[PDB]
Amino acid sequence: TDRQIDDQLLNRLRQSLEPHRSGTIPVHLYYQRADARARLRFGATWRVSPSDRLLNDLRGLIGSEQVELEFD
Amino acid sequence: TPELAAKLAAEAIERDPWAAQVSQLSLPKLVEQVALNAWKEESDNAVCLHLRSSQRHLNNRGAQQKLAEALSMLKGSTVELTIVEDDNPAVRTPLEWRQAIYEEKLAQARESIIADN
To answer: Could you say which of B109, B116, B117 has the minimum Cβ distance to residue A35?
Structure first.
């Protein structure tokens, strides 16, 4: 959703990814703006492990599984 | 998901008298693209659609005839409508106006995203 705190950017979001790392998966981010859709690539460091879907779906947030950018 | 493209076309219409007129005639799509890629000079009893010669191959009689009936409906009298080829950029068509409007907004959004922190 549009309304995300900030700390979510550097805290919960980051922490979900941080302990489950494996298999160089790029992180792509869709920030739904009122104005437009821009893509900000996290690529901070961590590549997420795949177990994260189940953990993420655990609370209030649905994700979508798109074609990975790298392959194309 | 262009939403923005048709909304953006509404601003183009809100500024260009020809774009507005075409939407009031309620052209289809091919013939609309001809009216859209051409700039509106207006004379005492004439409307001559100067389409960018840069896209000359898009102009086809199948479009022109439908455009002619529509321009005739607008004018209320028979307009000798032809598509003629002078590519000079001195004024902007209803299609050209729109494009500048699509991009700056996206750039501003990108800036806000970069600035989230």
So the answer is: B109
> Is the distance from CB of B96 to CB of B12 less than 8 angstroms?
no
Contact list in B for residue A38 (CB cut-off 8 A) is 106, 109-110, 113
Would the CB atoms of B106 and A31 count as touching at under 8 Å?
A: no
**Between chains, do A35 and B108 touch, taking CB under 8 Å as contact?**
yes
Q: CA–CA distance from A58 to each of A17, A47, A55, A66 (Å)? A: 14, 20, 5, 20
Angstrom distance (rounded) from CA B32 to CA B22: 7
Instruction: Please report which helix (H) or strand (E) contains residue B72, including its range.
Output: helix B61-75
* Torsion sign (Cα): A62, A67, B1, B4: positive
Q: How was it solved?
A: cryo-EM
Whole-angstrom distance, CA of residue B31 vs CA of residue B49: 11
